[PDB]
């Protein structure tokens, strides 16, 4: 038929894309910052430990205030943690006992909850009635939800296993933008600092840049092998870290849409479960499925530090906005808030 | 501070609330439903009770509460959420025998049996289920035994499939199912030919759950 020649045109334009890739790619992040500021060892300490949850812990997100903490586990609990004093703020019963994502609203009054029910559930923390009551029951995904990051106060973007990263709205529970294009199920979502863009991580092992609204793929980001389990974003810039099962937390630039270098290690054969950039993006804290957590030099790879000590697989890792702490929500039912 | 002590008291109340809730979840018996095809799984799930990716069927029978989980309507990658069901006490596998001579009726290359064995051994030797027993349910046994005389079980696989008798056919399919598991020392399957008697399927599920619980206690105790 003609699909063969149409795919040939697609292949030739892909060849032009790779020609531009190779032409613009002449050096590496290592080739620039060979031996600039050797971090050394910054091995931090288990400052606090939260043990409210009693089952497999999957998600956790820091708040804007850099103090309050949210986390979701297998049991239908969404306890709000007061990290500074190791206190319980709000234990939220959860209809879906299979949640793998939870996010704190930047305004500090809402928490989203996804999971295996394909529903992004939003709860109102500040209630004149006094109890956390569910505000919305966003639905429409044909697959399991994977991330529910609050794009803004009312608009919320989310990622599901239906290969679509939908954008929602608490004010009116309608689908603003589909953001289609992904081939495999999408695993993770990280917003831009200015929230006018966001990246998605999929099971097709390709990060993909989208606009906040009225957008499809601006840039395609291939180079991984197995699947993008988790993704992050630079604190302020055209960069984002990409975690995958193939043990490489590689990162890509945005203004240059090129691969920089891979955070590969000979000893590590396991995968990357969670990645959240450190302040200024100098480090790269990576979760692992070998009951360990380690941080990398974001510009020099290598062992900047080791954050290990968790019994089970590190499921979620988050870095505070102030940068004064790092929380590791491993599958073992404790939250160790490292320094 | 006074407000600090009040917050600590609130955290203590939260702690006891989550403690009692987790204790409640401990007594819960949670089973997972894997229907290879949407032909007999609905019938058997109706039997044991009497677009979310998971449907939580909860019921009781003779003072034992079962929280059934239906993941038939997932339409997504299995291994991404399969680790969420690592702690299930039992796996209820449902597969019909009224599938041969149709060959998936859409693919015409592999049988529902072949797809079912693929699914079954993928579950059995799966890392997250290295010690979880499987409740094997053989659905539409009445129609299978009705049509087995007119067409032998030699059609589904060209290998000799016994005589045309339903007894030999059932024995061969049961063996071809159990031998797929590679960890019979730790996990053992419960074959059962599902029939119109709904209550008997529920009591068979009770016997299976009692069995898995008693050997769980066996290893939990000093012996084993």
């Amino acid at each position: 038929s003609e699909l063969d020649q149409l795919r040939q045109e697609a292949e030739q334009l892909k060849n032009q894309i790779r020609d531009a890739r190779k032409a613009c790619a002449d050096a590496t992040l290592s080739q620039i910052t060979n031996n600039i500021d050797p971090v050394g060892r910054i091995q931090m300490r288990t400052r606090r430990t939260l043990r409210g949850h009693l089952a497999k812990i999957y998600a956790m997100h820091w708040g804007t205030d850099s103090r309050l903490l949210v986390s979701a586990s297998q049991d239908g609990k969404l306890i709000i943690w007061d990290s500074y004093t190791t206190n319980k703020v709000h234990a939220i019963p959860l209809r879906s006992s299979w949640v793998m994502t939870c996010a704190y609203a930047p305004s500090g009054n809402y928490v989203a909850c996804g999971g295996l029910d394909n529903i992004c559930s939003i709860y109102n923390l500040k209630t004149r009635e006094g109890n956390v009551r569910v505000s919305r029951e966003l639905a429409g995904h044909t697959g399991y939800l994977s991330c529910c990051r609050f794009l803004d106060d009312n608009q919320i973007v989310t990622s599901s296993g239906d290969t679509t990263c939908a954008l929602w709205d608490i004010e009116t529970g309608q689908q603003t933008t589909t953001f289609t294009g992904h081939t495999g199920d999408v695993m993770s979502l990280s917003l831009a600092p200015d929230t006018r863009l966001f990246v998605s991580g999929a099971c097709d092992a390709s990060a993909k840049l989208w606009d906040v609204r009225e957008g499809m793929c601006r840039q395609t980001f291939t180079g991984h092998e197995s699947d993008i389990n988790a993704i992050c974003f630079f604190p302020n810039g055209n960069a984002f870290a990409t975690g995958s099962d193939d043990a490489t937390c590689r990162l890509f630039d945005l203004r240059a849409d090129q691969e920089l270098m891979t955070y590969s290690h000979d000893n590590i054969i396991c995968g990357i479960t969670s990645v959240s950039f450190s302040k200024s993006g100098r480090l790269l804290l990576a979760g692992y499925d070998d009951f360990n957590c380690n941080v990398w030099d974001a510009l020099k790879a290598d062992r900047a530090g080791v954050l290990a000590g968790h019994d089970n697989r590190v499921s979620c890792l988050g870095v505070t906005d102030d940068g004064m702490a790092v929380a590791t929500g491993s599958w073992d039912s404790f939250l160790k808030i490292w320094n | 501070s006074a407000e600090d002590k009040a917050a600590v008291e609130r955290s203590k109340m939260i702690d006891r609330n989550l403690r009692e809730d987790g204790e409640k979840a401990a007594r819960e018996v949670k089973l997972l439903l894997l229907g290879a095809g949407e032909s007999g799984k609905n019938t058997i799930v109706k039997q044991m009770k009497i677009t979310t990716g998971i449907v939580e069927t909860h019921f009781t029978f003779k003072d034992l509460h079962f929280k059934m989980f239906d993941v038939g309507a997932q339409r997504s990658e299995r291994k991404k959420w399969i680790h969420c069901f690592e702690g299930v006490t039992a796996i209820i596998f449902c597969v019909a025998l009224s599938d041969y001579d149709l060959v998936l009726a859409e693919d015409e290359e592999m049988n529902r049996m072949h797809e079912s064995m693929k699914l079954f051994d993928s579950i059995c030797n799966n890392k997250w289920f290295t010690d979880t027993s499987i409740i094997l349910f053989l659905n539409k046994k009445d129609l299978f035994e009705e049509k087995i005389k007119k067409s032998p079980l030699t059609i589904c696989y060209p290998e000799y499939a016994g005589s045309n008798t339903y007894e030999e056919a059932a024995a061969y399919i049961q063996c071809q199912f159990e031998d797929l598991n590679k960890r019979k020392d730790t996990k053992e399957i419960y074959t059962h030919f599902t029939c119109s008697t709904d209550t008997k399927n529920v009591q068979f599920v009770f016997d299976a759950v009692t069995d898995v619980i008693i050997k769980n206690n066996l290893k939990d105790c000093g012996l084993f």
Partner: single-chain antibody
Amino acid sequence: DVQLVESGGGLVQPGGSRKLSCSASGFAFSSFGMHWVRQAPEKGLEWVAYISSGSGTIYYADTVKGRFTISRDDPKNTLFLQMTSLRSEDTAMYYCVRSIYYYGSSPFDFWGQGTTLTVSSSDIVMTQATSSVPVTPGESVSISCRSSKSLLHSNGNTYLYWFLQRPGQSPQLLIYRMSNLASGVPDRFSGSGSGTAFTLTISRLEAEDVGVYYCMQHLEYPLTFGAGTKLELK
């Protein structure tokens, strides 16, 4: 809602016993801690007792430590104020309030209607030297409050509580940490106090702002009040 229907009072003789069982419309009454605040007709507000959530911790004023006993009924959402003994000084206006406690909490947000007890006719000192002063609208009036002990704790918060109630009504909470406004109040109100000095600026004075103002301290369990300063619109 959170409407606290006070129920009790009456023309009880001294030394008697009365039931003051205020009812709660339902706001997880178990979750919220309850207070009792009295007010004689010729005096200001005065705290009486406090029970935490689930009858955890019970506190009484040293004046009413053994005379008054307070208890709650979580399934029915009521708190029972028993008076073992009654005196002339117990003649007061009893308002019970709701107070939840966490990081983002706003205690003393709602005060009940209250019930009259027409019986008969070392700690932080909240001076509140301001009195009833005639002020025209639009003026940036300021109400000063002082305390003996610095309200600032190691947590970095000063437990100052500003209140407003027009003559004959029940107080609402304006500022609960000298800096953070409550619900139902405009941005004009603001404490902006120091570690030991406290104020309240009202940029645009209104008839709603007409009324006495009381500052509270919550560093210690025995709570202290000032003397109301009615801002008459004249």
